[PDB]
PDB file of all heavy atoms in Angstrom:
ATOM      1  N   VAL E  86     100.630  92.320 110.832  1.00 46.48           N
ATOM      2  CA  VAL E  86      99.975  92.351 112.103  1.00 46.48           C
ATOM      3  C   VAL E  86      99.743  91.072 112.877  1.00 46.48           C
ATOM      4  O   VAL E  86     100.079  90.930 114.053  1.00 46.48           O
ATOM      5  CB  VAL E  86      98.639  93.101 111.980  1.00 46.48           C
ATOM      6  CG1 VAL E  86      98.044  93.352 113.376  1.00 46.48           C
ATOM      7  CG2 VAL E  86      98.873  94.358 111.340  1.00 46.48           C
ATOM      8  N   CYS E  87      99.316  90.061 112.160  1.00 46.34           N
ATOM      9  CA  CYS E  87      98.973  88.747 112.793  1.00 46.34           C
ATOM     10  C   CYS E  87     100.144  88.172 113.610  1.00 46.34           C
ATOM     11  O   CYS E  87      99.888  87.788 114.772  1.00 46.34           O
ATOM     12  CB  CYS E  87      98.560  87.738 111.797  1.00 46.34           C
ATOM     13  SG  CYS E  87      96.774  87.722 111.576  1.00 46.34           S
ATOM     14  N   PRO E  88     101.355  88.078 113.076  1.00 46.42           N
ATOM     15  CA  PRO E  88     102.546  87.806 114.009  1.00 46.42           C
ATOM     16  C   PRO E  88     102.617  88.726 115.128  1.00 46.42           C
ATOM     17  O   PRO E  88     102.719  88.202 116.269  1.00 46.42           O
ATOM     18  CB  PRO E  88     103.770  87.851 113.088  1.00 46.42           C
ATOM     19  CG  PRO E  88     103.292  88.423 111.775  1.00 46.42           C
ATOM     20  CD  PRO E  88     101.817  88.196 111.624  1.00 46.42           C
ATOM     21  N   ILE E  89     102.574  89.998 114.931  1.00 49.10           N
ATOM     22  CA  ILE E  89     102.600  90.966 116.043  1.00 49.10           C
ATOM     23  C   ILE E  89     101.563  90.718 117.088  1.00 49.10           C
ATOM     24  O   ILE E  89     101.804  90.594 118.324  1.00 49.10           O
ATOM     25  CB  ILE E  89     102.563  92.364 115.513  1.00 49.10           C
ATOM     26  CG1 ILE E  89     103.773  92.888 114.824  1.00 49.10           C
ATOM     27  CG2 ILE E  89     102.072  93.386 116.580  1.00 49.10           C
ATOM     28  CD1 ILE E  89     104.634  93.519 115.759  1.00 49.10           C
ATOM     29  N   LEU E  90     100.409  90.382 116.694  1.00 49.05           N
ATOM     30  CA  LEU E  90      99.327  90.145 117.544  1.00 49.05           C
ATOM     31  C   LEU E  90      99.469  88.791 118.262  1.00 49.05           C
ATOM     32  O   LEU E  90      99.190  88.705 119.534  1.00 49.05           O
ATOM     33  CB  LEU E  90      97.942  90.196 116.844  1.00 49.05           C
ATOM     34  CG  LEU E  90      96.656  89.871 117.504  1.00 49.05           C
ATOM     35  CD1 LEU E  90      96.274  90.750 118.731  1.00 49.05           C
ATOM     36  CD2 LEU E  90      95.563  89.993 116.431  1.00 49.05           C
ATOM     37  N   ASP E  91      99.861  87.747 117.504  1.00 49.96           N
ATOM     38  CA  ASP E  91     100.244  86.484 118.182  1.00 49.96           C
ATOM     39  C   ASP E  91     101.194  86.752 119.260  1.00 49.96           C
ATOM     40  O   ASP E  91     101.102  86.119 120.404  1.00 49.96           O
ATOM     41  CB  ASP E  91     100.872  85.493 117.192  1.00 49.96           C
ATOM     42  CG  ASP E  91      99.723  84.881 116.293  1.00 49.96           C
ATOM     43  OD1 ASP E  91      98.533  84.962 116.562  1.00 49.96           O
ATOM     44  OD2 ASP E  91     100.107  84.282 115.241  1.00 49.96           O
ATOM     45  N   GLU E  92     102.101  87.644 119.052  1.00 51.31           N
ATOM     46  CA  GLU E  92     103.101  87.973 120.101  1.00 51.31           C
ATOM     47  C   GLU E  92     102.484  88.799 121.192  1.00 51.31           C
ATOM     48  O   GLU E  92     102.826  88.608 122.443  1.00 51.31           O
ATOM     49  CB  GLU E  92     104.306  88.686 119.472  1.00 51.31           C
ATOM     50  CG  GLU E  92     105.389  88.923 120.510  1.00 51.31           C
ATOM     51  CD  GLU E  92     106.745  88.841 119.804  1.00 51.31           C
ATOM     52  OE1 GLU E  92     106.894  88.157 118.825  1.00 51.31           O
ATOM     53  OE2 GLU E  92     107.708  89.596 120.357  1.00 51.31           O
ATOM     54  N   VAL E  93     101.519  89.614 120.862  1.00 54.11           N
ATOM     55  CA  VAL E  93     100.818  90.304 121.902  1.00 54.11           C
ATOM     56  C   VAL E  93     100.185  89.370 122.833  1.00 54.11           C
ATOM     57  O   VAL E  93     100.277  89.423 124.108  1.00 54.11           O
ATOM     58  CB  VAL E  93      99.841  91.435 121.410  1.00 54.11           C
ATOM     59  CG1 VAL E  93      98.942  91.956 122.469  1.00 54.11           C
ATOM     60  CG2 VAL E  93     100.628  92.456 120.587  1.00 54.11           C
ATOM     61  N   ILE E  94      99.467  88.284 122.316  1.00 54.46           N
ATOM     62  CA  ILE E  94      98.671  87.426 123.147  1.00 54.46           C
ATOM     63  C   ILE E  94      99.618  86.556 124.109  1.00 54.46           C
ATOM     64  O   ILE E  94      99.161  86.138 125.095  1.00 54.46           O
ATOM     65  CB  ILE E  94      97.781  86.572 122.289  1.00 54.46           C
ATOM     66  CG1 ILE E  94      96.750  87.452 121.698  1.00 54.46           C
ATOM     67  CG2 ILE E  94      97.206  85.522 123.142  1.00 54.46           C
ATOM     68  CD1 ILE E  94      96.062  87.040 120.408  1.00 54.46           C
ATOM     69  N   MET E  95     100.854  86.319 123.645  1.00 56.52           N
ATOM     70  CA  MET E  95     101.774  85.641 124.497  1.00 56.52           C
ATOM     71  C   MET E  95     102.096  86.511 125.810  1.00 56.52           C
ATOM     72  O   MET E  95     102.560  86.060 126.735  1.00 56.52           O
ATOM     73  CB  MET E  95     103.015  85.317 123.772  1.00 56.52           C
ATOM     74  CG  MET E  95     102.769  84.280 122.711  1.00 56.52           C
ATOM     75  SD  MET E  95     104.138  83.613 121.895  1.00 56.52           S
ATOM     76  CE  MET E  95     105.474  83.896 123.005  1.00 56.52           C
ATOM     77  N   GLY E  96     101.768  87.740 125.755  1.00 53.20           N
ATOM     78  CA  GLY E  96     101.996  88.688 126.843  1.00 53.20           C
ATOM     79  C   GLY E  96     103.152  89.708 126.664  1.00 53.20           C
ATOM     80  O   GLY E  96     103.622  90.118 127.746  1.00 53.20           O
ATOM     81  N   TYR E  97     103.576  89.879 125.485  1.00 53.83           N
ATOM     82  CA  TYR E  97     104.578  90.923 125.242  1.00 53.83           C
ATOM     83  C   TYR E  97     103.951  92.308 124.920  1.00 53.83           C
ATOM     84  O   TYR E  97     102.665  92.379 124.665  1.00 53.83           O
ATOM     85  CB  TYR E  97     105.430  90.607 123.903  1.00 53.83           C
ATOM     86  CG  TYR E  97     106.276  89.316 124.066  1.00 53.83           C
ATOM     87  CD1 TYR E  97     105.910  88.067 123.685  1.00 53.83           C
ATOM     88  CD2 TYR E  97     107.670  89.471 124.552  1.00 53.83           C
ATOM     89  CE1 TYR E  97     106.692  86.976 123.726  1.00 53.83           C
ATOM     90  CE2 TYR E  97     108.486  88.301 124.559  1.00 53.83           C
ATOM     91  CZ  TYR E  97     108.013  87.096 124.135  1.00 53.83           C
ATOM     92  OH  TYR E  97     108.899  85.981 124.245  1.00 53.83           O
ATOM     93  N   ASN E  98     104.687  93.395 124.894  1.00 53.21           N
ATOM     94  CA  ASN E  98     104.221  94.621 124.465  1.00 53.21           C
ATOM     95  C   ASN E  98     104.668  94.858 122.962  1.00 53.21           C
ATOM     96  O   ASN E  98     105.711  94.308 122.474  1.00 53.21           O
ATOM     97  CB  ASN E  98     104.884  95.796 125.198  1.00 53.21           C
ATOM     98  CG  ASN E  98     104.317  95.907 126.505  1.00 53.21           C
ATOM     99  OD1 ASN E  98     103.153  95.586 126.794  1.00 53.21           O
ATOM    100  ND2 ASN E  98     105.144  96.424 127.415  1.00 53.21           N
ATOM    101  N   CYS E  99     103.865  95.481 122.165  1.00 55.96           N
ATOM    102  CA  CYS E  99     104.198  95.631 120.822  1.00 55.96           C
ATOM    103  C   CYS E  99     103.608  97.056 120.360  1.00 55.96           C
ATOM    104  O   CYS E  99     102.672  97.567 121.004  1.00 55.96           O
ATOM    105  CB  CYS E  99     103.658  94.540 119.905  1.00 55.96           C
ATOM    106  SG  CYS E  99     104.365  92.936 120.223  1.00 55.96           S
ATOM    107  N   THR E 100     104.291  97.667 119.407  1.00 52.14           N
ATOM    108  CA  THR E 100     103.972  98.862 118.791  1.00 52.14           C
ATOM    109  C   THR E 100     104.057  98.723 117.277  1.00 52.14           C
ATOM    110  O   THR E 100     104.967  98.105 116.760  1.00 52.14           O
ATOM    111  CB  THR E 100     104.843 100.118 119.233  1.00 52.14           C
ATOM    112  OG1 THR E 100     104.825 100.006 120.732  1.00 52.14           O
ATOM    113  CG2 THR E 100     104.346 101.324 118.713  1.00 52.14           C
ATOM    114  N   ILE E 101     103.094  99.335 116.602  1.00 54.74           N
ATOM    115  CA  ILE E 101     103.181  99.527 115.129  1.00 54.74           C
ATOM    116  C   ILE E 101     102.944 101.042 114.829  1.00 54.74           C
ATOM    117  O   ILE E 101     102.023 101.558 115.201  1.00 54.74           O
ATOM    118  CB  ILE E 101     102.142  98.736 114.377  1.00 54.74           C
ATOM    119  CG1 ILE E 101     101.865  97.258 114.977  1.00 54.74           C
ATOM    120  CG2 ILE E 101     102.502  98.479 112.906  1.00 54.74           C
ATOM    121  CD1 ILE E 101     101.178  96.318 114.038  1.00 54.74           C
ATOM    122  N   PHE E 102     104.049 101.601 114.251  1.00 58.91           N
ATOM    123  CA  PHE E 102     104.079 102.985 113.818  1.00 58.91           C
ATOM    124  C   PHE E 102     103.669 103.102 112.343  1.00 58.91           C
ATOM    125  O   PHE E 102     104.154 102.277 111.609  1.00 58.91           O
ATOM    126  CB  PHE E 102     105.389 103.665 113.979  1.00 58.91           C
ATOM    127  CG  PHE E 102     105.931 103.924 115.366  1.00 58.91           C
ATOM    128  CD1 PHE E 102     106.837 103.075 116.017  1.00 58.91           C
ATOM    129  CD2 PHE E 102     105.459 105.063 115.959  1.00 58.91           C
ATOM    130  CE1 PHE E 102     107.245 103.427 117.328  1.00 58.91           C
ATOM    131  CE2 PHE E 102     106.007 105.378 117.359  1.00 58.91           C
ATOM    132  CZ  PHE E 102     106.833 104.519 117.983  1.00 58.91           C
ATOM    133  N   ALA E 103     103.006 104.162 112.045  1.00 56.80           N
ATOM    134  CA  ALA E 103     102.795 104.562 110.648  1.00 56.80           C
ATOM    135  C   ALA E 103     103.467 105.816 110.348  1.00 56.80           C
ATOM    136  O   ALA E 103     103.065 106.802 110.936  1.00 56.80           O
ATOM    137  CB  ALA E 103     101.253 104.689 110.244  1.00 56.80           C
ATOM    138  N   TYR E 104     104.444 105.842 109.601  1.00 54.16           N
ATOM    139  CA  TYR E 104     105.284 106.986 109.214  1.00 54.16           C
ATOM    140  C   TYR E 104     105.209 107.362 107.773  1.00 54.16           C
ATOM    141  O   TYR E 104     104.892 106.508 106.934  1.00 54.16           O
ATOM    142  CB  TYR E 104     106.676 106.717 109.600  1.00 54.16           C
ATOM    143  CG  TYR E 104     107.654 107.841 109.424  1.00 54.16           C
ATOM    144  CD1 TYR E 104     107.848 108.758 110.556  1.00 54.16           C
ATOM    145  CD2 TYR E 104     108.338 108.176 108.287  1.00 54.16           C
ATOM    146  CE1 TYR E 104     108.683 109.862 110.479  1.00 54.16           C
ATOM    147  CE2 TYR E 104     109.161 109.339 108.137  1.00 54.16           C
ATOM    148  CZ  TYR E 104     109.373 110.090 109.284  1.00 54.16           C
ATOM    149  OH  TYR E 104     110.124 111.189 109.083  1.00 54.16           O
ATOM    150  N   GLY E 105     105.270 108.580 107.527  1.00 53.46           N
ATOM    151  CA  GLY E 105     105.158 109.021 106.098  1.00 53.46           C
ATOM    152  C   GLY E 105     104.496 110.453 106.059  1.00 53.46           C
ATOM    153  O   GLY E 105     104.095 111.010 107.104  1.00 53.46           O
ATOM    154  N   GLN E 106     104.553 111.129 104.898  1.00 52.14           N
ATOM    155  CA  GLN E 106     104.043 112.443 104.652  1.00 52.14           C
ATOM    156  C   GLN E 106     102.614 112.526 104.419  1.00 52.14           C
ATOM    157  O   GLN E 106     102.097 111.461 103.949  1.00 52.14           O
ATOM    158  CB  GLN E 106     104.786 113.261 103.553  1.00 52.14           C
ATOM    159  CG  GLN E 106     104.559 112.681 102.154  1.00 52.14           C
ATOM    160  CD  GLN E 106     104.466 113.827 101.136  1.00 52.14           C
ATOM    161  OE1 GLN E 106     104.061 114.943 101.410  1.00 52.14           O
ATOM    162  NE2 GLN E 106     104.919 113.526  99.934  1.00 52.14           N
ATOM    163  N   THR E 107     101.906 113.545 104.819  1.00 52.78           N
ATOM    164  CA  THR E 107     100.461 113.580 104.736  1.00 52.78           C
ATOM    165  C   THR E 107      99.955 113.256 103.335  1.00 52.78           C
ATOM    166  O   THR E 107     100.438 113.757 102.275  1.00 52.78           O
ATOM    167  CB  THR E 107      99.931 115.040 105.014  1.00 52.78           C
ATOM    168  OG1 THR E 107     100.258 115.498 106.365  1.00 52.78           O
ATOM    169  CG2 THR E 107      98.495 115.146 104.726  1.00 52.78           C
ATOM    170  N   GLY E 108      98.868 112.380 103.298  1.00 56.41           N
ATOM    171  CA  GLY E 108      98.337 112.024 102.033  1.00 56.41           C
ATOM    172  C   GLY E 108      98.931 110.843 101.392  1.00 56.41           C
ATOM    173  O   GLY E 108      98.780 110.708 100.133  1.00 56.41           O
ATOM    174  N   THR E 109      99.609 110.017 102.126  1.00 58.43           N
ATOM    175  CA  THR E 109     100.250 108.785 101.608  1.00 58.43           C
ATOM    176  C   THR E 109      99.538 107.461 102.043  1.00 58.43           C
ATOM    177  O   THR E 109      99.932 106.413 101.658  1.00 58.43           O
ATOM    178  CB  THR E 109     101.612 108.763 101.847  1.00 58.43           C
ATOM    179  OG1 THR E 109     101.918 108.652 103.251  1.00 58.43           O
ATOM    180  CG2 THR E 109     102.328 109.959 101.278  1.00 58.43           C
ATOM    181  N   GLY E 110      98.698 107.618 103.114  1.00 61.29           N
ATOM    182  CA  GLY E 110      97.966 106.458 103.615  1.00 61.29           C
ATOM    183  C   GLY E 110      98.355 105.931 104.964  1.00 61.29           C
ATOM    184  O   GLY E 110      98.125 104.786 105.279  1.00 61.29           O
ATOM    185  N   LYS E 111      98.814 106.805 105.868  1.00 58.75           N
ATOM    186  CA  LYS E 111      99.111 106.349 107.226  1.00 58.75           C
ATOM    187  C   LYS E 111      97.809 106.046 107.909  1.00 58.75           C
ATOM    188  O   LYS E 111      97.750 105.033 108.657  1.00 58.75           O
ATOM    189  CB  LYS E 111      99.836 107.488 107.945  1.00 58.75           C
ATOM    190  CG  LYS E 111     101.118 107.771 107.378  1.00 58.75           C
ATOM    191  CD  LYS E 111     101.771 108.978 108.122  1.00 58.75           C
ATOM    192  CE  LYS E 111     100.866 110.194 108.376  1.00 58.75           C
ATOM    193  NZ  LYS E 111     100.786 111.096 107.200  1.00 58.75           N
ATOM    194  N   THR E 112      96.824 106.933 107.812  1.00 56.30           N
ATOM    195  CA  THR E 112      95.508 106.717 108.377  1.00 56.30           C
ATOM    196  C   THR E 112      94.601 105.667 107.663  1.00 56.30           C
ATOM    197  O   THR E 112      93.890 104.959 108.219  1.00 56.30           O
ATOM    198  CB  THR E 112      94.768 108.008 108.525  1.00 56.30           C
ATOM    199  OG1 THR E 112      95.455 108.834 109.424  1.00 56.30           O
ATOM    200  CG2 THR E 112      93.343 107.851 108.930  1.00 56.30           C
ATOM    201  N   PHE E 113      94.778 105.682 106.366  1.00 57.50           N
ATOM    202  CA  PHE E 113      94.385 104.492 105.573  1.00 57.50           C
ATOM    203  C   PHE E 113      94.807 103.215 106.259  1.00 57.50           C
ATOM    204  O   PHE E 113      93.945 102.447 106.686  1.00 57.50           O
ATOM    205  CB  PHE E 113      94.797 104.568 104.068  1.00 57.50           C
ATOM    206  CG  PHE E 113      94.196 103.589 103.209  1.00 57.50           C
ATOM    207  CD1 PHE E 113      92.912 103.724 102.641  1.00 57.50           C
ATOM    208  CD2 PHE E 113      94.777 102.424 103.006  1.00 57.50           C
ATOM    209  CE1 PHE E 113      92.331 102.806 101.840  1.00 57.50           C
ATOM    210  CE2 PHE E 113      94.209 101.362 102.177  1.00 57.50           C
ATOM    211  CZ  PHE E 113      93.005 101.544 101.692  1.00 57.50           C
ATOM    212  N   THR E 114      96.105 103.062 106.348  1.00 53.88           N
ATOM    213  CA  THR E 114      96.679 101.862 106.954  1.00 53.88           C
ATOM    214  C   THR E 114      96.273 101.502 108.351  1.00 53.88           C
ATOM    215  O   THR E 114      95.919 100.369 108.609  1.00 53.88           O
ATOM    216  CB  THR E 114      98.271 101.917 106.807  1.00 53.88           C
ATOM    217  OG1 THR E 114      98.621 102.077 105.455  1.00 53.88           O
ATOM    218  CG2 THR E 114      98.907 100.683 107.335  1.00 53.88           C
ATOM    219  N   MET E 115      96.248 102.417 109.255  1.00 52.07           N
ATOM    220  CA  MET E 115      95.979 102.074 110.654  1.00 52.07           C
ATOM    221  C   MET E 115      94.525 102.052 111.000  1.00 52.07           C
ATOM    222  O   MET E 115      94.114 101.447 112.008  1.00 52.07           O
ATOM    223  CB  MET E 115      96.676 103.000 111.686  1.00 52.07           C
ATOM    224  CG  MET E 115      98.080 103.311 111.315  1.00 52.07           C
ATOM    225  SD  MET E 115      99.071 101.962 111.774  1.00 52.07           S
ATOM    226  CE  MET E 115      98.709 101.885 113.440  1.00 52.07           C
ATOM    227  N   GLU E 116      93.680 102.732 110.200  1.00 51.41           N
ATOM    228  CA  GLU E 116      92.215 102.705 110.552  1.00 51.41           C
ATOM    229  C   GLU E 116      91.421 102.249 109.498  1.00 51.41           C
ATOM    230  O   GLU E 116      90.616 101.269 109.536  1.00 51.41           O
ATOM    231  CB  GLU E 116      91.730 104.060 110.982  1.00 51.41           C
ATOM    232  CG  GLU E 116      92.609 104.911 111.948  1.00 51.41           C
ATOM    233  CD  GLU E 116      92.136 106.140 112.350  1.00 51.41           C
ATOM    234  OE1 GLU E 116      90.880 106.374 112.276  1.00 51.41           O
ATOM    235  OE2 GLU E 116      92.912 107.073 112.819  1.00 51.41           O
ATOM    236  N   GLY E 117      91.550 102.623 108.234  1.00 46.26           N
ATOM    237  CA  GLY E 117      90.865 102.213 107.087  1.00 46.26           C
ATOM    238  C   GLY E 117      89.681 103.103 106.704  1.00 46.26           C
ATOM    239  O   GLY E 117      89.653 104.270 107.132  1.00 46.26           O
ATOM    240  N   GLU E 118      88.879 102.671 105.876  1.00 48.45           N
ATOM    241  CA  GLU E 118      87.771 103.431 105.160  1.00 48.45           C
ATOM    242  C   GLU E 118      86.596 102.529 105.036  1.00 48.45           C
ATOM    243  O   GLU E 118      86.669 101.284 105.416  1.00 48.45           O
ATOM    244  CB  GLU E 118      88.274 103.840 103.833  1.00 48.45           C
ATOM    245  CG  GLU E 118      89.386 104.982 103.903  1.00 48.45           C
ATOM    246  CD  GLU E 118      89.677 105.746 102.531  1.00 48.45           C
ATOM    247  OE1 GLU E 118      89.226 105.259 101.439  1.00 48.45           O
ATOM    248  OE2 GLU E 118      90.414 106.756 102.572  1.00 48.45           O
ATOM    249  N   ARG E 119      85.503 103.150 104.604  1.00 50.30           N
ATOM    250  CA  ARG E 119      84.381 102.299 104.334  1.00 50.30           C
ATOM    251  C   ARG E 119      84.139 102.108 102.774  1.00 50.30           C
ATOM    252  O   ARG E 119      84.324 103.058 101.949  1.00 50.30           O
ATOM    253  CB  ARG E 119      83.090 102.949 104.960  1.00 50.30           C
ATOM    254  CG  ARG E 119      83.030 102.751 106.367  1.00 50.30           C
ATOM    255  CD  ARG E 119      83.226 101.263 106.816  1.00 50.30           C
ATOM    256  NE  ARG E 119      82.218 100.852 107.743  1.00 50.30           N
ATOM    257  CZ  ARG E 119      81.187 100.188 107.562  1.00 50.30           C
ATOM    258  NH1 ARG E 119      80.998  99.614 106.305  1.00 50.30           N
ATOM    259  NH2 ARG E 119      80.336  99.967 108.479  1.00 50.30           N
ATOM    260  N   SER E 120      83.875 100.844 102.484  1.00 48.93           N
ATOM    261  CA  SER E 120      83.614 100.525 101.085  1.00 48.93           C
ATOM    262  C   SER E 120      82.325 101.408 100.674  1.00 48.93           C
ATOM    263  O   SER E 120      81.365 101.521 101.516  1.00 48.93           O
ATOM    264  CB  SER E 120      83.239  99.020 100.962  1.00 48.93           C
ATOM    265  OG  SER E 120      84.464  98.303 100.839  1.00 48.93           O
ATOM    266  N   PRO E 121      82.323 101.981  99.510  1.00 49.99           N
ATOM    267  CA  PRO E 121      81.270 102.866  99.173  1.00 49.99           C
ATOM    268  C   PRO E 121      79.889 102.268  99.285  1.00 49.99           C
ATOM    269  O   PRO E 121      79.660 101.121  99.292  1.00 49.99           O
ATOM    270  CB  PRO E 121      81.542 103.319  97.785  1.00 49.99           C
ATOM    271  CG  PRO E 121      82.853 102.737  97.508  1.00 49.99           C
ATOM    272  CD  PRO E 121      83.478 102.140  98.661  1.00 49.99           C
ATOM    273  N   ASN E 122      78.884 103.107  99.528  1.00 47.90           N
ATOM    274  CA  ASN E 122      77.486 102.782  99.325  1.00 47.90           C
ATOM    275  C   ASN E 122      77.072 101.733 100.258  1.00 47.90           C
ATOM    276  O   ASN E 122      76.074 100.852  99.989  1.00 47.90           O
ATOM    277  CB  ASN E 122      77.151 102.388  97.894  1.00 47.90           C
ATOM    278  CG  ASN E 122      75.804 102.818  97.404  1.00 47.90           C
ATOM    279  OD1 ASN E 122      75.612 103.960  97.030  1.00 47.90           O
ATOM    280  ND2 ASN E 122      74.791 101.911  97.510  1.00 47.90           N
ATOM    281  N   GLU E 123      77.615 101.720 101.582  1.00 48.94           N
ATOM    282  CA  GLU E 123      77.064 100.896 102.609  1.00 48.94           C
ATOM    283  C   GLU E 123      76.914  99.425 102.337  1.00 48.94           C
ATOM    284  O   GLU E 123      76.057  98.733 102.797  1.00 48.94           O
ATOM    285  CB  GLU E 123      75.756 101.410 103.028  1.00 48.94           C
ATOM    286  CG  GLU E 123      75.327 101.287 104.531  1.00 48.94           C
ATOM    287  CD  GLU E 123      74.480 102.421 104.966  1.00 48.94           C
ATOM    288  OE1 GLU E 123      73.412 102.657 104.316  1.00 48.94           O
ATOM    289  OE2 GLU E 123      74.805 103.002 106.018  1.00 48.94           O
ATOM    290  N   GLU E 124      77.982  99.016 101.456  1.00 51.15           N
ATOM    291  CA  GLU E 124      77.923  97.662 100.865  1.00 51.15           C
ATOM    292  C   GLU E 124      78.223  96.485 101.835  1.00 51.15           C
ATOM    293  O   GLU E 124      77.690  95.492 101.710  1.00 51.15           O
ATOM    294  CB  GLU E 124      78.955  97.578  99.770  1.00 51.15           C
ATOM    295  CG  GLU E 124      78.946  96.420  98.870  1.00 51.15           C
ATOM    296  CD  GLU E 124      79.965  96.377  97.686  1.00 51.15           C
ATOM    297  OE1 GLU E 124      80.953  97.287  97.738  1.00 51.15           O
ATOM    298  OE2 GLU E 124      79.850  95.583  96.742  1.00 51.15           O
ATOM    299  N   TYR E 125      79.121  96.761 102.836  1.00 51.52           N
ATOM    300  CA  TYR E 125      79.459  95.737 103.862  1.00 51.52           C
ATOM    301  C   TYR E 125      79.163  96.351 105.229  1.00 51.52           C
ATOM    302  O   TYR E 125      79.299  97.582 105.549  1.00 51.52           O
ATOM    303  CB  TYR E 125      80.961  95.341 103.801  1.00 51.52           C
ATOM    304  CG  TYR E 125      81.522  94.884 102.472  1.00 51.52           C
ATOM    305  CD1 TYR E 125      81.853  95.749 101.542  1.00 51.52           C
ATOM    306  CD2 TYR E 125      81.586  93.493 102.230  1.00 51.52           C
ATOM    307  CE1 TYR E 125      82.448  95.332 100.400  1.00 51.52           C
ATOM    308  CE2 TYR E 125      82.136  93.055 100.988  1.00 51.52           C
ATOM    309  CZ  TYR E 125      82.499  93.962 100.068  1.00 51.52           C
ATOM    310  OH  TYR E 125      83.053  93.546  98.881  1.00 51.52           O
ATOM    311  N   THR E 126      78.867  95.348 106.157  1.00 51.90           N
ATOM    312  CA  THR E 126      78.879  95.784 107.699  1.00 51.90           C
ATOM    313  C   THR E 126      80.356  96.079 107.969  1.00 51.90           C
ATOM    314  O   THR E 126      81.308  95.773 107.279  1.00 51.90           O
ATOM    315  CB  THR E 126      78.373  94.606 108.503  1.00 51.90           C
ATOM    316  OG1 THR E 126      79.441  93.573 108.612  1.00 51.90           O
ATOM    317  CG2 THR E 126      77.206  93.905 107.821  1.00 51.90           C
ATOM    318  N   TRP E 127      80.459  96.782 109.151  1.00 51.91           N
ATOM    319  CA  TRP E 127      81.806  97.181 109.531  1.00 51.91           C
ATOM    320  C   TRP E 127      82.675  95.995 109.767  1.00 51.91           C
ATOM    321  O   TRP E 127      83.969  96.034 109.594  1.00 51.91           O
ATOM    322  CB  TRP E 127      81.696  97.907 110.825  1.00 51.91           C
ATOM    323  CG  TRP E 127      81.663  97.177 112.036  1.00 51.91           C
ATOM    324  CD1 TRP E 127      80.515  96.654 112.728  1.00 51.91           C
ATOM    325  CD2 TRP E 127      82.787  96.596 112.728  1.00 51.91           C
ATOM    326  NE1 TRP E 127      80.860  95.973 113.838  1.00 51.91           N
ATOM    327  CE2 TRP E 127      82.224  95.874 113.897  1.00 51.91           C
ATOM    328  CE3 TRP E 127      84.134  96.713 112.576  1.00 51.91           C
ATOM    329  CZ2 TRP E 127      83.124  95.159 114.751  1.00 51.91           C
ATOM    330  CZ3 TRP E 127      84.972  95.973 113.548  1.00 51.91           C
ATOM    331  CH2 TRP E 127      84.483  95.257 114.492  1.00 51.91           C
ATOM    332  N   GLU E 128      82.173  94.827 110.172  1.00 52.38           N
ATOM    333  CA  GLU E 128      83.082  93.625 110.445  1.00 52.38           C
ATOM    334  C   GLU E 128      83.648  93.140 109.196  1.00 52.38           C
ATOM    335  O   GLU E 128      84.716  92.534 109.258  1.00 52.38           O
ATOM    336  CB  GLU E 128      82.329  92.503 111.193  1.00 52.38           C
ATOM    337  CG  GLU E 128      82.261  92.706 112.709  1.00 52.38           C
ATOM    338  CD  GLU E 128      81.061  92.042 113.376  1.00 52.38           C
ATOM    339  OE1 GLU E 128      81.078  90.708 113.471  1.00 52.38           O
ATOM    340  OE2 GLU E 128      80.088  92.711 113.823  1.00 52.38           O
TER     341      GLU E 128
END
């Protein structure tokens, strides 16, 4: 992502797709999850 974002800040367009079958981590990868038991702040 960091290269992609570096390129976004230069003023380009970019897309990152997550492809794969249900239950393999597409939503894991693009959004994430919370560490159990309220251990960390969201940042």
Side-chain angles (χ1 to χ4, degrees):
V86 184
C87 268
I89 283 270
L90 175 61
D91 283 345
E92 183 146 332
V93 172
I94 293 154
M95 294 186 23
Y97 294 94
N98 292 327
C99 300
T100 308
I101 319 196
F102 289 104
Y104 185 90
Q106 69 142 327
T107 298
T109 64
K111 301 176 312 278
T112 291
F113 189 84
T114 297
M115 320 280 301
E116 314 185 19
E118 292 192 346
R119 285 305 229 109
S120 277
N122 213 82
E123 210 151 48
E124 188 176 16
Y125 306 84
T126 78
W127 86 263
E128 275 151 77

